[PDB]
Amino acid sequence: MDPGKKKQHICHIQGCGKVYGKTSHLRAHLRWHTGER
């Protein structure tokens, strides 16, 4: 849904706390969270 209330992309994972607007960035960012050890 384009209109209506908007939603922000926040790191649901307990640890981070940044802000995102594009979902495509979530993937690139997710790899950093999982790809650690």
Query: Site residues (CB under 5 A) for Zn ion?
Result: 11, 16
Give the span between the Cα atoms of 7 and 32, in whole angstroms: 23
Q: How far is the CB of 11 from Zn ion (least distance, A)?
A: 4
Buried b (16+ CB within 10 A) or exposed e, 1-19: eeeeeeeeeeeeeeeeeee
Q: How far is the CB of 34 from Zn ion (least distance, A)?
A: 11
Q: How far is the CB of 4 from Zn ion (least distance, A)?
A: 26
